Amino acid sequence: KKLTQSDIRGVFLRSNLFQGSWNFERMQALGFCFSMVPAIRRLYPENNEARKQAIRRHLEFFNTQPFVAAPILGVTLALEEQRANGAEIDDGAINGIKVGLMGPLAGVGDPIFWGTVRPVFAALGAGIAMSGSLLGPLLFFILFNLVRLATRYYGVAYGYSKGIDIVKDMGGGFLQKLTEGASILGLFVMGALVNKWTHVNIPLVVSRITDQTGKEHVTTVQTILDQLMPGLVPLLLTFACMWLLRKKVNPLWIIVGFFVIGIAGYACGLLGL
Amino acid sequence: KKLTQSDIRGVFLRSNLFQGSWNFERMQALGFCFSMVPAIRRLYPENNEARKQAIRRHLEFFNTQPFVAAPILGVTLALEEQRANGAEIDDGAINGIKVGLMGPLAGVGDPIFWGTVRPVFAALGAGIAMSGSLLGPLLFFILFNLVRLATRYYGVAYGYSKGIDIVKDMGGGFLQKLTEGASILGLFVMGALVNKWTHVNIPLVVSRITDQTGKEHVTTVQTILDQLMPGLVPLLLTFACMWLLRKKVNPLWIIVGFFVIGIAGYACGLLGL
């Protein structure tokens, strides 16, 4: 019955706390019913058949990313008028669209926001949080809590006015651009983080004299490698750890390996700050 | 009557001082007659109908850039033989071609020579004129008075041998290349000029101690912004002024605003060198 404009404003505010009740039986399922409560408020009175829709919102998984869930919310909002006002019969396909947009959007949203957004802003605002005070943990909170809000408001509004017809339309071509541009920024930044923002030092001396009236002209192994490239050892360690992780080893079982190495290597002069 | 090769040499030398008599009634109109005087010298004797062409060279505007006016000169030179020697009847279309090449060439020449040529050489030879002596105001005069001459000699010669037929030919495709490559150089250089070759400083202190046996460890606001990007404030001022100029405010009414700010800001400690 003509979902009011302010009702979309309501679904936006009620979708901020989307992730549940993140269960294991029905992940985010209750969070979807909670996000659609305001729609069902003015869409229906208290009735047997009119209030069985909350049953179908629980009917199965809805396990996608919290941020790419605004297009799905807007599409499923639009589907309700065609079932409430237009009365165009549709029962299974409402969940059909949920399941169909579960798949691609779970794999195109994870390598962006947990991909080149969270650890790129978390890296911009953490090279500053070391030295600085409030330009690190504040360039994060401002710049990341905007990109998540421009993905939710412009998600719901722009996925509500456009029904099914432009789900199959922008589901081809645009997201390939958006995830090929993401994994260029996130690869350019991660190449720099591995190089500069890691510390590895090898104090093994390999050369004597020590000319020029007592300068000792010391040249440890770190100078030999810094003659080639000033970040080589962390680069190789990254490819070792990057190879281990495909074998699904726990990252909490590779960190302990490094904790062992940092003790057994500093007690033999191999590693040392 | 077979315009001599040296006559083209003459039109080149007489086209250097093209801009008039830059009137407001008929802009550059007399300058076109003056540039075509050498052609009409040997093309005609003294006659009633033979000397009415100078009337038609004044007949209307010719308001384009001085530098993209060599192709038009060469084309209109070629049109004369077909009216003098070939006698192929053409009266209105001689001005038709002038008016047709007025439009595009006035909008493709201004954003190049007044675009990425005059203020790019004027910027290369002005970062040197500050410190140096004669590599600034001489890398300008040599490098810019060649690009204007290669645009006039190679304009007239190459637009004379090719009549109308290759006006519609090189009027498509080549100039898009030439103005998409121009506004890459001129944007790359103007991004650097806004950053480095501007001075903005904010001496507002925001932090005390001042450890390390009397170093005072002063950290004004300029250090906070230089922690993010060392040219931020002039960048924002550029977007403010870049927004004002679309509203057709006089640039002599934005400079006075800055003169007010530089006095009211240095007398309160906000701005200061």
Place this chain on the structure above:
Amino acid sequence: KKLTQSDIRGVFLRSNLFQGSWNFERMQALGFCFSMVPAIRRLYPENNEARKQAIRRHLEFFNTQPFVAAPILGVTLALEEQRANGAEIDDGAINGIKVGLMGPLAGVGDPIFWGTVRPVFAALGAGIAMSGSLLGPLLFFILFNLVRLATRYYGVAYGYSKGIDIVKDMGGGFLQKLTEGASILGLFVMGALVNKWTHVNIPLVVSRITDQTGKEHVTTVQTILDQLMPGLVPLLLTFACMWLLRKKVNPLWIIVGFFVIGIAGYACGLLGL
């Protein structure tokens, strides 16, 4: 008779010392027979017609690069079964393929290995051999004697399993990629070598005082040119020498010119370290 896998291992090891007996009558010709000896070992017994193939391996030139000669070796190995086992008649075309792959592979291999491989590794391992000790003449010997071996083992194996049919296939498209990517790396590195790894200095003083309590504020001609670009004079010398070499002047007759200039220029103050 089913050339054993180890026989290919043998041809690889016997092809390392390919270049001859590099004669002038039949360049590399004997080196080809020597590389194919192991094939003819188990392919034939001692016989009149069975041992006339060594005659045809000498029958003409085989004048290509030593490194792009593994595809040709693998192709000509494959041609033998079709003449020995399959007995499919072919006498002239065995040399036909040799001559056909002589031409393009001599002009696509020289501007790579003598192009952007030998003097790129020879430049990486010679900016270090000046200061360092064993990361210059060892980053060369490891990194260049692998690229020549990956070009021979993967050449012979991958040009043996694929007969004629994929000579005309990978002879179109792939090598254009491989030599347009080569002459980007080798141009990027040679632009840097001309700039930094050359020394040219001009001690001609052009300016007096010499303020600031005895600093002499000396500004020779080298400072004027370093105000524009810190490698200009070697850049111009490169274009002069780069122009001379098209005229097929002996490079041993341009080096002596520089030896004359370095003596006649240091004895007049023009050049000087």
Place this chain on the structure above:
Amino acid sequence: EITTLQIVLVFIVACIAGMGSILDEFQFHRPLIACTLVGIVLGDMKTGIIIGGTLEMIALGWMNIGAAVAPDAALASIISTILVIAGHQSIGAGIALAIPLAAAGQVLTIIVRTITVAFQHAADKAADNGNLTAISWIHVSSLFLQAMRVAIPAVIVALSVGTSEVQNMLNAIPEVVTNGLNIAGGMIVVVGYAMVINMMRAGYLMPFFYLGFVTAAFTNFNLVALGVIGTVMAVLYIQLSPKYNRV
């Protein structure tokens, strides 16, 4: 040392940074905001912000992906600052001690997520009748049970750190081990990077890795400058690459 009007503030900040552990929107499930917020309430702010900066570099690539629970950087970044800001310790000791807490971490937040099922088995009984208020107060009510299991172990600590039993058992490390963990603090961070690069790894985009690698060794850009050059390069690559031009 710690006063009763600081215990409540630490409790509330832990509750806020416990809401975010599952909620994953405003990102108090991050060792940056959850660390400055504790540093402000407990005491000096710079020595908490430094912990925050150091702890994210590990906690990149600590995401949840489809019932693959992350090591819970929300509990490892509140206990790991009370043991530095409040009790007299060093940065590298807290960074090293965070890892077992992060292991506590998902063990706790998996039991909580598993026992949350009773909030949906009590949700269908509400959808069968209505109204939706029975749902709007059941979805939130499952959020006041996870924030009370990242904020209670942050009060058991901040009331037991103030005793000699722990403050003297934390000095027999010894000092040889401590400096051997400030050295692993430049190495363990690499794991956090490898998990990220494994997500965004395309064979044809790896040239942008080694390009952002070399330009870090020999140039003095920020991470803002390297994050701007990255986006400029990405936009221009998408602008070229005729895969987006034609068929």
Place this chain on the structure above:
Amino acid sequence: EITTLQIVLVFIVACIAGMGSILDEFQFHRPLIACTLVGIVLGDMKTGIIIGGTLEMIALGWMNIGAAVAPDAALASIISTILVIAGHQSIGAGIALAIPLAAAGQVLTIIVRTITVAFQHAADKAADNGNLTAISWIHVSSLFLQAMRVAIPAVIVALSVGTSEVQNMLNAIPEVVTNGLNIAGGMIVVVGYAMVINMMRAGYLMPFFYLGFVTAAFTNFNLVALGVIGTVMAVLYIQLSPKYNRV
């Protein structure tokens, strides 16, 4: 101070830099050549070249576009060096005083252009009869009337600067205002840039702006190096971008 054989040279240099104001070809309508040429004739050369360098940075984007007359950097760069080279002043004072002169500027050069109409109403009367010499000496004759209105106000000044009436009225600025104009001299220049970027602004080429911005902050290239990297980038972009490859 100023001798009679310097007045004539200043007059001739102003005439040359007054020809260029409309002519716009050899660019003495620029505060660089018009400033070194005055510095050479008046006195010391470096302190005029520095004025020239500083004054262009403002006078970028001071072009004429279709009866939109520019603020006339040809008069603002000759009076603004006589008041520095000749009379005992500082760079920033002249740069600040140039702006009202540039305002004088197009007011003068618009009256001259408007009164030039009599050179065309006397041109048609020549085309109706010939010869063309009646045109070749009417086109130039309209050029000896604009150069005599950028070179006369450059002799009224250079003969009145040499008196105590002006040389003592130019010291009650005071010194607080002077240092407040050397600060605006790093800000007003931005306007000159914004007019340029507004001409060459394409939404898809703005990535090349912020790229040339960041590379200026953290690198020590010249403007020659930044003008060469720019052209290399432009040529390679035109070489790619299959808009120029297919149909």
Place this chain on the structure above:
Amino acid sequence: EITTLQIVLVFIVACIAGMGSILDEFQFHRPLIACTLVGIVLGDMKTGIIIGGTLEMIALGWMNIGAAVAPDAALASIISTILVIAGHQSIGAGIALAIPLAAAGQVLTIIVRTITVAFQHAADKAADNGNLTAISWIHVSSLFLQAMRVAIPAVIVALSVGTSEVQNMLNAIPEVVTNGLNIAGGMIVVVGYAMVINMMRAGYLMPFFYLGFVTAAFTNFNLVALGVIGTVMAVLYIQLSPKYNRV
């Protein structure tokens, strides 16, 4: 000075670096390996490696291309280190004296290649009968005759350098000429570059020359970093450039 157990090692190292002159595979036909190998056997190693590094920069572009014999950097880099490592001289003197030796060079290695014909006129007489061992010991036997003409002039030298007749005739240079050759040692290298750029010169790839030029002037990359940025740029250019897309 030089002992009998160093003459044999110099002889063997010259033989090894004489095999490579035609063989052109393992690259002892290079003034880098052939110089460190002589420096190790003769004496101090650093002062031979420095000669090696300096001598390649000339010996870039010293390749063989189709009966266009190179100036033989294999003889010019063994005599030119015995006259530095063994006899008491400077780097720039040896670098300058290498050029006439390189001229000796291809004159020798052309006579050897020409007289090699007798190894093929004695090869056909073997193919007409077999076995192939008659070929496998004729191909190698033509290699033990070129290595004995880059390793014999490296023993005539290393037994005559140890006398006052040469060691005193090498001091009347004089010292004015010596410092005039350490200056040409920064210029002659340019020839070695021009021969290389002439091979890989495409009119549309010259933008990558002037790009690698400017980035050398104003940046502190290595040659490893400039060799990695080069390959990244090449791979990305090949990835773009729809010449490899379209059909």
